[PDB]
User: Fold Heat shock protein hslJ from Escherichia coli.
Amino acid sequence: MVTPEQLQHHRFVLESVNGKPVTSDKNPPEISFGEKMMISGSMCNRFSGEGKLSNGELTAKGLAMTRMMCANPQLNELDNTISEMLKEGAQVDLTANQLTLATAKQTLTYKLADLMN
Assistant:
């Protein structure tokens, strides 16, 4: 079962959207977590919010974001996906070393590229 502790010290990098990979020079839409299961992430417009983990469901008790753009459309739309998923309760299938989501919105797949080989 997914647990909170196995997340609060382990970043993940966006590896594949449902629709395509992502390639972002050296600044990918990675995501990180920390104490209280809190969330900081960067689809394009930045986000943050008070995460939770108790059964496999990542809800944000308060998201917040900016109004940026990123010169590709994908990254700038991907913000609304994460916003939706974290409102509704993103079903978190973190396996051995790959994060998978699958919510009403879409699926998203991230890597434990945790800077610890």
